[PDB]
RNA sequence: ACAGGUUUGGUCCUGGCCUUUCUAUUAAUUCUUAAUAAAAUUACACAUGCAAGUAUCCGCGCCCCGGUGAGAAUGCCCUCCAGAUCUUAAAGAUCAAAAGGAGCAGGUAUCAAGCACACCUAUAACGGUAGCUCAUAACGCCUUGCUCAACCACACCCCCACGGGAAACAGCAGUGAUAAAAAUUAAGCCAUGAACGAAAGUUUGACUAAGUUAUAUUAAUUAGAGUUGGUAAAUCUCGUGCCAGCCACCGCGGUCAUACGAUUAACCCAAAUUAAUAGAUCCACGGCGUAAAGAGUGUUUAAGAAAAAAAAUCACAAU
């Protein structure tokens, strides 16, 4: 990327390196911030940097911006059970908010690592099929077993053409 | 699934009503549906040919209604047996008829649906069930003076084992799990062959379905 | 073209290719209607042996006979390829020698 | 494979079936084996059926499930 | 306790477009969508119908919507829940004081 | 595909090239094709002996009893295959075929010796 | 082939041990107690062996399958000789 | 793309076309054998044989498998899922209609407005309000199966099929017509799969094992094709004389041709070689004084930017 102020924030690595995963009960995040004043530096930098990372990890969570409606920047979270979480940011920096958000509503490290651990067992190594879903495609790709007749031609005694010839004779 | 260009098809619903209306109005009668030619063994209505294992019983026996028409009230409260049970089962098996309604289409009145009470191997049920396999040419009728001879039954207790050993590999896993969890008892596992009682294949099944319980 | 304009117009996608004189089919069968001679444009001057045939799709187009010498007459069956002759404007088909009623070039004897 | 509405063939329109011969001694023993074999498999089928009920019940309202539900609720407050 | 819904959106926040119809407000929901080519997020606008029983909707409000357990028609599938920001009458959720943009209408440090 | 009825069944699905069969123990709707869509693949069954003279069989035992528990039917060969492993008792048709082999072999031995004398 | 005989050098990654805990205590690898039917030599199930049916049942089957009957056979041989 | 050929007397810049790489079909020339994979003109009309039976009568099953890509921008992913069936301790599971939407989804705006496409009350009437979709593409038109363990759709035609036209191979093999497109009117239920029976078992052109074809890959038993001005590996002697002819782009031939045709020699692939048509790939995160490009001007709506600082002008010929 050439255009833009910070082209690095528009690459797949930057979108994927942000680790903030909301719980299944989080649906709506509303961010209000001001375009003037030194107090809103943390809020504006949070919108300019971290929000793309947050949305990429939570595709199903609505994120809506509102500019210059409240003198004090804040973040509002709407849960599934109607619960409202209000986060107040007036001097916290860009980094602080992400750490604060990750603790009130983010998922725990043990929960994330066990979630993908249970995902691994779906692609069981012992199965056969297409390359996109299974490792091997046939039993001939295992050393020791009878190889595919395409690569190594089979002995005549095992070919069905020879088997039928002797039965009819 | 849906799209913004859905066309309201009407002929498909129209055909469904007429087809349903036609079959109800033209429902074949039991007399013409089960009429059989006794030489070619071919069904004039369905075009089906009976298997050779059933040829002998057709010409040497009569169906239920053929032996039931010549009775005062179509034999209510009578006992009816079947040749299939008589040949294979030494124990008496019979039906106690509750109600019967033949069809008027037949000129000889040799067809109809009947209900009754089931008595299999001396075991009597407490509910009425519609009689299955009525059209089969194997039924017989017991006499009045022989009614109590067949009704009398000698109860013989069952000698089948109530427990059998597990299959070998599945037996090993049972031992392996309890040993792993700390249960070190060496009692041999057994299988409760009590809930797996199987009725013999000749036992007639319930024609009526089962509603939610 | 700024970011918003690029987003609105979407990525550029190559248009599909335009069908050629043979309507996308590799080879076509035609019937000879008339045999004549066409002349090229300068600085190349000669007498090119061409023919006019009606293809199996019903259209009538001008074709060219490669090689030296031919025995094609009216109402003959030939097979046409999709090549083009650079010297002759308009001509965009060539008869493939050796099929149906046109044979290979005859060696001098 | 044929469909419901197509007519059947002409050559094979007279025959219906031809059951094979029955060995008396062999058939009775084979029938006896099946009666016990079906009984044994049915008990295993019901035993596996009860196992599935136990597994599903523990996943829904097991003790560990209540611990998990209370833990997240306690953390949220 | 079966009061679920089949829609993918349970709670959404959008801006009111118009209140022309009877006891129903047409709102516009905004979400961020990633453009595959530019890897940049742009807003995608969708229109939703919400049932307002008290006729409390003024054009320009920001309204939270709650999924309706049973649709009332082919379009009205959401019910209004609360008025997050009344137009022109915005109270700061933190200090609970009236405000007009950046300047506080009433000073929060003056209880009396 | 939307089928009218059908029952869940554990069966063998063919695979591999000609003269080299290879069966996959799969569990799919009975009305779907033999190599068609399936619910879960359980194991494998190599029909040809390897250099060690072994015919490899793979079984997903905890999953196999799960599908049987929920009412899945078994075909003829999988019952014979499970019976050999010991998960199920020997199929009655497996024993009868064995007995027929002995009687045919006994007839073969007598017939050869009778001609010899 | 040369790399298989060690005549040529190639990278060999360091590989962790296959298992986490090395225990032979489990019954999958350790010998399980014999079954009561295994030590006795009796077949695992009563119906695995061949039993002579009662003559009454044989007569019933002959009547039912009369005409299409086949020659009956006795008990199978215990051991099959080799040709 | 590691780029190459080509504008001009000549240089630089800008900008097209074409070469070099890989896959498929047909055709030309050529051809020895074996194995495996694949088999493809046509939703045009079809001779004949076969493709669904099983079973002590009831019953169950009978495009399910298989076949095709005609139709529809159809759709993909996803929420919910009645109902049918299987198992059983009546609550578990397999397939999932209808309906619904976070997002994604061919070309065309010279298709810019569609014309009832909304909602309230209670009724499931009546009455009341005058709204709904759309330049982020509504409404139209054209082309098209697909995002592939597979999915969606059609089963002679009239989207459907009471009816009517009319008398059905888009099941295997085969035939007519048509197209540049060319497999056997064959064997068996031994395996596996499906249907039925309690069961031995039966049926099965699905399939299994074969027949046919350089269409692909391999091994070997097999040798011909193309090219030799430049890009681009490689030639001499004759004939011909802007003639006959050649070329993928630039070009050659006008009595001394390494470019035409033949000969000698060489080069490059090889049971294949070359040609033809499609496809993979390929344009701009680049540009707008002189090159195609800042629209004759200003304000405003939709929309978007603000983030540090700071900013109401002014002798004179506005109207
Ligand atoms: K160039
Ligand atoms: K078979
Ligand atoms: Mg029938
Ligand atoms: Mg050419
Ligand atoms: Mg040129
Ligand atoms: Mg020829
Ligand atoms: Mg020919
Ligand atoms: Mg195959
Ligand atoms: Mg120039
Ligand atoms: Mg020049
Ligand atoms: Mg050919
Ligand atoms: Mg071959
Ligand atoms: Mg029966
Ligand atoms: Mg298909
Ligand atoms: Mg086509
Ligand atoms: Mg089409
Ligand atoms: Mg259309
Ligand atoms: Mg559905
Ligand atoms: Mg349901
Ligand atoms: Mg249910
Ligand atoms: Mg025009
Ligand atoms: Mg139709
Ligand atoms: Mg048909
Ligand atoms: Mg055909
Ligand atoms: Mg047809
Ligand atoms: Mg023909
Ligand atoms: Mg072909
Ligand atoms: Mg031919
Ligand atoms: Mg022939
Ligand atoms: Mg046959
Ligand atoms: Mg046979
Ligand atoms: Mg069979
Ligand atoms: Mg069965
Ligand atoms: Mg073959
Ligand atoms: Mg040559
Ligand atoms: Mg040449
Ligand atoms: Mg000369
Ligand atoms: Mg050249
Ligand atoms: Mg030459
Ligand atoms: Mg210009
Ligand atoms: Mg310019
Ligand atoms: Mg301008
Ligand atoms: Mg302007
Ligand atoms: Mg504005």
Boundaries of every domain in chain C = 1-109
Task: Give C-chain residues touching A3 at CB under 8 angstroms.
Answer: 2-3
Identify whether F46 is preceded by a cis peptide bond (ω within 30 of 0): no
Angle at Cα G64 formed by Cα G61 and Cα G68, nearest 5°?
95
CATH 3.40.50.880 fits C1-109, yes or no: no
Q: Chains C vs D: touching, with 3+ CB pairs under 8 Å?
A: no
Cα–Cα distance measured from residue E63 to residue E15, given in angstroms and rounded to the nearest whole number = 6
8 Å CB contact of E101 and A68 = yes
Query: Among all residues of chain D, which has the CA nearest to that of G67?
Result: D21
8 Å CB contact of E31 and A63 = yes
Residues F13-30, buried b or exposed e (16+ Cβ, 10 A)? bebbeeebebbbbbbbbe
Sequential DSSP letters for chain D: ---SSS---SGGGS-------B-HHHHHHHHHHHHHHHHHHHHHHHHHHHHHHHHHHHHHH-HHHHHHHHHHHHHH-
| Dihedral angle computed from the Cα positions of residues A36, A37, A38 and A43, in that order, rounded to the nearest 10 degrees | -50
Cα–Cα distance measured from residue G2 to residue C23, given in angstroms and rounded to the nearest whole number = 58
> Which CATH number belongs to the domain containing residue E105 in this structure?
2.40.50.140
Backbone angles phi, psi at A120, to 5 degrees: -65, -35
The beta strands (E) that lie in B44-188 are given as 79-82, 94-102, 112-120, 123-130, 139-141, 163-165
3-class DSSP state for residue C106? coil
Cross-chain CB nearest to D36 (options G47, G52, G58): G47
Cα–Cα distance measured from residue C49 to residue C105, given in angstroms and rounded to the nearest whole number = 14
Residue B130 burial by Cβ neighbours in a 10 Å radius (0-12, 13-18, 19+): middle
Sheet with E98-100, edge to edge strand ranges: E90-91, E98-100, E103-104
Helix axis angle, F61-69 to D24-61, nearest 10°: 100
Which residue range forms the structural domain that includes residue E24?
A: 1-109
| Dihedral angle computed from the Cα positions of residues B92, B98, B101 and B106, in that order, rounded to the nearest 10 degrees | 20
Task: Give A-chain residues touching E99 at CB under 8 angstroms.
Answer: 70-71
Cα–Cα distance measured from residue F55 to residue A139, given in angstroms and rounded to the nearest whole number = 12
The number of C-beta contacts closer than 8 angstroms across A and F is 45
**Residues contacting C67, CB < 8 A, separation 6+:** C97, C104, C105
Cα–Cα distance measured from residue E73 to residue G38, given in angstroms and rounded to the nearest whole number = 72
SS (H, E, C) chain F: CCCCCCCEEEEEECCCCCCCCCEEEEEEECCCCCCCCCCEECCEECCCCCCCCCCCEECCHHHHHHHHHCCCEECHHHHHHHHHHCCCCCCHHHHHHHHHHHHHHHHHHHHHHHHHC
Check if the beta carbon of residue F94 is closer than 8 Å to that of residue F60: no
In the DSSP assignment, the letter for residue A81 is: T
Cα–Cα distance measured from residue A23 to residue A5, given in angstroms and rounded to the nearest whole number = 32
Give the pair of three-digit tokens for residue C52.
Answer: 């006019």
Cα–Cα distance measured from residue E104 to residue E91, given in angstroms and rounded to the nearest whole number = 9
Q: Which nucleotides of H are covered by protein (CB under 7 A)?
A: 25-29, 34-37, 49-59, 61-66, 72-75, 78-80, 84-90, 92-107, 118-121, 128-134, 136, 139, 149-152, 159-162, 178-181, 191-195, 197-202, 204, 206-211, 217, 242-254, 261-262, 275-279, 281-287, 303-304, 306-308
Q: For residue A69, which of A27, A29, A31 has the smallest C-alpha distance? A: A31
Whether residue F4 lies within 8 A of chain G, CB to CB, comes out as no
Of all nucleotides, the one whose C1′ comes closest to residue F32's CA is H64
> After which residues, if any, is chain C broken (C to N > 2.5 Å)?
none
Q: For residue F21, which of A146, B176, B163 has the smallest C-alpha distance? A: A146
Q: How many C-beta atoms lie closer than 10 Å to residue E48's C-beta?
A: 19
8 Å CB contact of F96 and D33 = yes
| Dihedral angle computed from the Cα positions of residues F44, F45, F48 and F54, in that order, rounded to the nearest 10 degrees | 100
| Ligand 44 center from residue E77 Cα (angstroms) | 29
List Cα–Cα distances, F112 to F103, G46, G75, G79, in angstroms: 14, 35, 21, 17
Query: How much helix, strand and coil, in percent to the nearest 5, is found in chain G?
Result: 20, 0, 80
CA R_g for chain E? 17
Length of chain A: 169
3-class DSSP state for residue B181? helix
Cα–Cα distance measured from residue C67 to residue C108, given in angstroms and rounded to the nearest whole number = 13
Residue E76 burial by Cβ neighbours in a 10 Å radius (0-12, 13-18, 19+): middle
Q: Which residues of F are annotated as a binding site for Zn(2+)?
A: 17
Q: Is the CA virtual torsion E72, E77, E82, E87 positive or negative?
A: negative
Cα–Cα distance measured from residue A68 to residue E102, given in angstroms and rounded to the nearest whole number = 7
Cα–Cα distance measured from residue B124 to residue B127, given in angstroms and rounded to the nearest whole number = 9
Conformation bin of residue E42: beta by default, left when phi > 0, alpha when psi is -120 to 50: beta
Q: Which residue is nearest to nucleotide H135 (CA to C1')?
A: C8
Q: For residue B90, which of B61, B125, B121 has the smallest C-alpha distance? A: B121
Cα–Cα distance measured from residue B67 to residue B141, given in angstroms and rounded to the nearest whole number = 7
Residues of D with CB under 8 A from a CB of F: 26, 30, 33-34, 37, 40-41, 44-45, 48-49, 51-52
Cα–Cα distance measured from residue F81 to residue F61, given in angstroms and rounded to the nearest whole number = 13
Total domains, chain E: 1
Check if the beta carbon of residue B92 is closer than 8 Å to that of residue B153: yes
8 Å CB contact of D21 and G69 = yes
Task: Give F-chain residues touching D40 at CB under 8 angstroms.
Answer: 89
Chain F: give the shortest CA distance to residue D14, in Å.
Answer: 31
Chain G: give the shortest CA distance to residue B88, in Å.
Answer: 7
3-class DSSP state for residue B121? coil
Query: Among all residues of chain F, which has the CA nearest to that of G44?
Result: F89
Backbone angles phi, psi at B22, to 5 degrees: -65, -45
In the DSSP assignment, the letter for residue A142 is: S
Question: In angstroms, how far is H289 C1' from E40 CA?
Answer: 34
Way it was determined: cryo-EM
8 Å CB contact of G76 and F95 = no
Domains of chain F, start order: 1-117 (3.30.1320.10)
| Dihedral angle computed from the Cα positions of residues C13, C14, C18 and C20, in that order, rounded to the nearest 10 degrees | -150
Task: Give D-chain residues touching F95 at CB under 8 angstroms.
Answer: 33
Cα–Cα distance measured from residue G39 to residue G33, given in angstroms and rounded to the nearest whole number = 10
Chain B: give the shortest CA distance to residue G64, in Å.
Answer: 8
Chain D: give the shortest CA distance to residue F53, in Å.
Answer: 31
**Residues contacting A44, CB < 8 A, separation 6+:** A33, A34, A35
Best D4, D14, D16, D27 member to test B by mutation, with max B CBs in 10 Å, is D16
Q: Chains G vs F: touching, with 3+ CB pairs under 8 Å?
A: yes
3-class DSSP state for residue B48? coil
């Amino acid at each position: 990327p050439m255009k833009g102020r910070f082209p690095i924030r528009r690459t797949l690595q930057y979108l994927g390196q942000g680790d903030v995963v909301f719980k299944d009960s989080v649906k709506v995040m509303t961010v209000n911030y001001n375009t003037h004043g030194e107090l809103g530096e943390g809020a504006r930098k949070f919108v300019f940097f971290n929000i793309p990372q947050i949305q990429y990890k939570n595709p199903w969570v609505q994120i809506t911006m509102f500019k210059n409606m409240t003198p004090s920047p804040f973040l509002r979270f709407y849960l599934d059970s109607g619960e409202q979480v209000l986060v107040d940011v007036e001097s916290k920096s860009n980094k602080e908010i992400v750490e604060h958000i990750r603790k009130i509503l983010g998922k725990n490290e043990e929960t994330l690592e066990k979630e993908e651990q249970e995902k691994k067992q779906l692609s069981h190594p012992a199965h056969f099929g297409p390359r996109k879903y299974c490792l091997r495609e046939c039993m001939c790709e295992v050393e020791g077993q009878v190889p595919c007749p395409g690569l190594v031609p089979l002995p005549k005694e095992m070919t069905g053409k020879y088997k039928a010839a002797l039965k009819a004779t | 699934m849906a799209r913004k260009k859905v066309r309201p098809r009407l002929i498909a619903e129209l055909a469904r009503r007429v087809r349903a209306l036609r079959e109800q109005r033209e429902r074949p009668r039991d007399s013409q549906r089960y009429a059989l030619d006794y030489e070619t063994m071919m069904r004039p209505h369905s075009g089906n040919r009976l298997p050779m294992r059933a040829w002998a019983d057709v010409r040497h026996e009569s169906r239920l209604l053929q032996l039931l028409n010549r009775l005062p009230l179509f034999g209510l409260g009578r006992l009816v047996t079947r040749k299939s049970w008589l040949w294979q089962h030494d124990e008496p098996c019979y039906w106690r008829l509750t109600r019967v309604r033949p069809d008027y289409a037949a000129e000889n009145l040799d067809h109809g649906k009947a209900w009754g009470i089931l008595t299999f191997k001396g075991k009597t049920e407490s509910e009425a069930r519609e009689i299955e396999q009525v059209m089969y040419h194997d039924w017989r009728l017991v006499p009045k003076h022989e009614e109590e001879a067949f009704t009398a039954f000698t109860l013989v207790p069952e000698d089948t084992p109530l427990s059998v050993p597990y299959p070998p590999l599945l037996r090993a896993m049972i031992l392996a799990q309890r040993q792993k969890y700390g249960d070190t008892s060496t009692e041999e596992p057994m299988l409760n062959l009590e809930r797996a009682r199987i009725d013999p294949w000749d036992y007639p099944a319930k024609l009526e379905a089962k509603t939610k319980t | 073209a700024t970011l918003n304009q690029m987003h609105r117009l979407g990525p550029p996608k190559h248009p599909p290719g335009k069908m050629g004189p043979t309507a996308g089919r590799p080879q076509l069968k035609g019937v000879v209607l008339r045999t004549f001679i066409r002349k090229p444009k300068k600085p190349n001057s000669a007498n090119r042996k061409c023919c006019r045939v009606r293809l199996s799709t019903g259209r009538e187009a001008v074709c060219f006979i490669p090689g030296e010498g031919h025995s094609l007459q009216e109402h003959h069956v030939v097979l046409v390829q999709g090549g083009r002759t650079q010297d002759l404007p308009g001509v965009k088909l060539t008869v493939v020698r050796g099929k149906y009623d046109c044979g290979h070039v005859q060696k001098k004897k | 494979r044929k469909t419901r509405h197509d007519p059947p063939a002409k050559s094979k329109a007279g025959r219906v079936a031809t059951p094979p011969a029955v060995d008396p001694t062999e058939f009775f023993v084979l029938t006896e084996r099946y009666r016990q074999y079906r009984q044994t498999v049915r008990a295993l089928r019901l035993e596996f059926m009860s196992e599935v009920r136990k597994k599903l019940h523990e996943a829904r309202a097991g003790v560990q499930a209540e611990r998990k539900a209370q833990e997240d609720a306690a953390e949220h407050r | 306790s079966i009061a679920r819904s089949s829609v993918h959106a349970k709670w959404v926040v959008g801006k009111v477009i118009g209140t022309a119809m009877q006891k129903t407000a047409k709102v516009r929901v905004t979400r961020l969508v990633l453009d595959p080519y530019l890897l940049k997020y742009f807003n995608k606008r969708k229109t939703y119908f919400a049932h307002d029983a008290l006729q409390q909707c003024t054009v320009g409000d920001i309204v939270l919507l709650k999924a309706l357990p049973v649709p009332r028609t082919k379009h009205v599938k959401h019910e209004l829940a609360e008025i997050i920001f009344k137009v022109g009458q915005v109270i700061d959720p933190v200090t609970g004081k009236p405000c007009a943009g950046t300047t506080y209408l009433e000073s929060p440090i003056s209880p009396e | 595909r939307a089928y009218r009825g059908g029952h869940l069944t554990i069966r063998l699905a063919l695979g591999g090239c000609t003269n080299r069969p290879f069966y996959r123990i799969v569990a799919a709707h009975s009305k779907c094709p033999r190599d068609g869509r399936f619910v879960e693949q359980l194991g494998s069954y190599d029909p040809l002996p390897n250099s060690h003279g072994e015919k490899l069989v793979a079984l997903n035992f905890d999953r196999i009893r799960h599908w049987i528990g929920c009412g899945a039917h078994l075909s003829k060969p999988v019952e014979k295959l499970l019976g050999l492993s010991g998960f199920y008792p020997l199929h009655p048709m497996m024993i009868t075929n064995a007995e027929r082999l002995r009687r045919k072999r006994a007839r073969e031995v007598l017939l050869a010796s009778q001609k010899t004398d | 082939k040369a790399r298989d005989h060690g005549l040529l050098r190639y990278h060999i990654p360091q590989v962790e041990p296959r298992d986490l805990d090395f225990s032979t205590t489990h019954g999958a690898v350790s010998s399980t107690p014999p079954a009561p039917t295994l030590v006795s030599g009796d077949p695992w199930y009563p119906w695995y062996s061949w039993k002579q049916p009662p003559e009454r049942e044989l007569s019933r089957l002959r009547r039912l399958y009369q005409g299409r009957l086949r020659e009956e056979s006795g008990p199978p041989p215990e051991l099959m000789p080799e040709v």
